[PDB]
Design a protein around this ligand. Structure first.
Ligand SMILES: N[C@H]1[C@@H](Oc2ccc([N+](=O)[O-])cc2)O[C@H](CO)[C@H](O)[C@@H]1O
Ligand SMILES: [Cl-]
Ligand SMILES: [Co+2]
Ligand SMILES: [Mn+2]
Ligand SMILES: [Zn+2]
Length: 654
């Protein structure tokens, strides 16, 4: 029993009750997965494994979620529970590497109580000493837990992570595991946010990636659908898997912005006031504008500390003693230096001591005990700066967000927004909201982001919009409404660079990403094809260093180039490597300063993706020196010494 799709083969063994995944390479298949068991319900703390094969049906010419392709339908039965399971797999003639899966269960004579449903599990075939993993969960830890994680098979430890999306976790419902020969991505196939896990677990000699959803009581003689997923077999690293997921999710209407519609100002070099913390003033910001303009900056953020309270989002009298005319004086001055102006806010937060909470508590989320619910930190808990959550289904809550947008753009003259410092959305029990279930608030969080953005666009189609779920992967269902992504308070060069690759995969190769400004890492920002940003008030040699790198970034402009993620594999090619094509020229960046993956010794550098018949001169564009005078495209290999980074371009020579 087998079905085929572009780039993928799926086989079922009825004796085994197992599934094996294959990927096409050249003229032959490569086996991506070990034979893997079908996902089952969990009852009384145990997954049910009494299921027996009933039938397998294969259709060769059919049309499914992804359009025309193939389908395999497997029916199984459990005598102890009375459950009949229907497991459907679909492939696509067009979409590369992708398998769609859906599961339903039918109960017999008695009700079945299920705590959790496991959808699909794939254990990787052919692993040796290490497996690399992409982990999209929103449960934290914040900031200091890497999104990309090495699973070492030679050590004492056993890697295990749930990768949650729930009332305390709002990130990306995807996980990937990969080796030199490639990997398997699993992601939630839903147009809207729902509770799901994508666990990654080390096994005895490998690792497995899976997906699962919350249980329910299944009534006697009833049929219910429990969950649907996308799997992607791929060569290379997590970029290829995540790109597959992006392509799949288009079919469900989750479509990221096309290059032609992204505004010019969302590719601009930016300086933010956060360097001064809460002690910025209008005149301090204005005083920097001449030097910022001359050095090449084209965008300014007014960061945190401008407002009275969240929800109200009114001007703080100490910062704006003359009211709205002071805000206009700031944005006018920014505009006079040829720049756009952005404003910091925290969407979903209606404050605690706000006028909004005092006058309209009915707009807010209510907990099970009848108290106002605080916005959660990742994994649960709260933060003193986080206020009460606005309910996304209360019309007045949404209106408060829209009114803020209209005031900031039309009364104060701002050109865009930096959303920040917010994560998931608590469950709502307010009976006056008439919720279908308490999770409905969590599910509909992204409506705040959508309605806000639509209001922004109506004022100015070139408006800038960003959201930072700081220290975690960004809320996936916010992404359609963005013009730029930040790597989100990265705590290392490893974090910022690898996340650039992940976001490019999910959003498109021309989608704007910034490496952020938590630490000074100008070479990381340029070489990844990211937008270089800064927040500090600099002097002396550090000022010279910022000017230098503004000049380089403004010369090569790799933030506007086509990111290329399919040539090198993070953790398997000799160096951590990034590639961008700009104005018909290939730019490469090699790094050694990331402690998570860095070679012993001094391996040769290989330039991939050049024309085999052409000859190239290799130039270090930072230092303006030739590192290799003439390389053929089919054998572009050289050795050069560098301590942290090497940024080069391949110049065609006649
Ligand atoms: N990433 C944001 C963000 O950074 C933080 C700071 C603290 C916390 N926190 O205490 O969870 C989270 C994100 O807010 C800061 C302002 O308060 C700045 O605007 C940064 O650029
Ligand atoms: Cl990371
Ligand atoms: Co942030
Ligand atoms: Mn281990
Ligand atoms: Zn509500």
């Amino acid at each position: 029993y087998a079905i085929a799709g572009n780039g993928v083969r799926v086989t079922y063994d009825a004796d085994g009750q197992t599934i094996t995944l294959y990927r096409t390479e050249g003229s032959g298949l490569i086996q991506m997965s070990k034979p893997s068991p079908l996902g089952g319900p969990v009852i009384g703390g145990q997954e049910v494994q009494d299921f027996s094969h009933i039938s397998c049906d294969v259709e060769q010419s059919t049309s499914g979620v992804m359009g025309s392709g193939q389908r395999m339908t497997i029916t199984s039965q459990s005598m102890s529970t009375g459950l009949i399971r229907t497991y459907v797999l679909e492939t696509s003639d067009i979409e590369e590497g992708v398998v769609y899966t859906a599961t339903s269960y039918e109960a017999g004579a008695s009700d079945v109580e299920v705590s959790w449903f496991i959808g699909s599990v794939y254990e990787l075939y052919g692993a040796e000493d290490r497996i690399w993993s992409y982990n999209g969960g929103g449960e934290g830890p914040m900031h200091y837990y890497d999104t990309l994680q090495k699973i070492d098979l030679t050590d004492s430890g056993k890697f295990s992570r749930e990768n949650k999306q729930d009332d305390t976790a709002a990130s990306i419902p995807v996980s990937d595991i990969y080796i030199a020969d490639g990997g398997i991505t699993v992601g939630d196939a839903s147009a809207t946010r729902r509770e799901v896990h994508t666990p990654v677990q080390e096994t005895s000699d490998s690792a497995q990636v899976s997906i699962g959803w919350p249980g329910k009581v299944i009534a006697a003689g009833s049929v219910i659908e429990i969950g649907e997923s996308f799997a992607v077999v791929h060569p290379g690293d997590y970029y290829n898997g995540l790109r597959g997921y992006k392509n799949a999710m288009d079919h469900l209407g989750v479509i990221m912005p096309a290059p032609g519609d992204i505004p010019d100002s969302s590719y601009d070099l930016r300086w933010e006031s956060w360097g001064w913390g809460f002690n910025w003033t209008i005149d301090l910001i204005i005083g920097k504008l001449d030097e910022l303009q001359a050095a090449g900056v084209k965008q300014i953020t007014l960061d945190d500390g401008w407002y009275t309270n969240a929800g109200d989002w009114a001007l703080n009298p100490e910062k704006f003693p003359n009211g709205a005319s002071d805000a206009l004086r700031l944005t006018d001055a920014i505009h006079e230096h040829g720049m756009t102006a952005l404003l910091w806010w925290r969407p979903c937060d209606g404050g605690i001591d706000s006028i909004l909470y005092q006058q309209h508590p009915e707009y807010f989320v209510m907990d099970a005990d009848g108290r106002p619910a605080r916005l959660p930190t990742p994994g649960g808990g709260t933060n003193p700066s986080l206020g009460y959550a606005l309910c996304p289904m209360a019309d007045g809550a949404i209106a408060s967000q829209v009114d803020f947008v209209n005031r900031a753009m039309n009364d104060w003259g701002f050109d865009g927004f930096k959303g920040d410092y917010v994560w998931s959305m608590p469950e709502c029990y307010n009976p006056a909201h008439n919720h279908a279930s308490p999770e409905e608030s969590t599910e509909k969080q992204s409506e705040i982001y959508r309605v806000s953005y639509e209001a922004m666009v109506a004022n100015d189609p070139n408006v800038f919009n960003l959201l930072c779920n700081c220290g975690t992967p960004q809320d996936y269902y916010s992404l359609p409404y963005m013009t730029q992504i930040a790597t989100a308070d990265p705590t290392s060069v490893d974090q910022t660079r690898r996340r650039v690759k992940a976001y490019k995969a999910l959003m498109g190769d021309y989608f704007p990403v910034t490496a952020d400004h938590n630490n000074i890492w100008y070479p990381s920002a340029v070489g990844t094809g990211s937008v270089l940003i800064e927040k500090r008030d600099l002097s002396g040699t550090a000022k010279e260093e910022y000017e230098k790198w503004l000049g380089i970034a403004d010369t090569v402009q790799l933030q506007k180039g086509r990111f290329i993620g399919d040539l090198y594999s993070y953790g398997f090619d000799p160096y951590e490597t990034y590639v961008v094509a700009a104005d018909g020229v290939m730019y490469y960046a090699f790094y050694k300063d990331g402690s998570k993956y860095s070679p012993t010794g001094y391996p040769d550098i290989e330039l991939k993706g050049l024309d085999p018949n052409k000859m190239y001169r290799i130039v270090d564009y930072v230092n303006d020196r030739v590192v290799a005078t003439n390389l053929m495209g089919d054998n572009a290999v050289f050795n050069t010494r560098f301590s942290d980074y090497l940024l080069v371009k391949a110049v065609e020579i006649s």
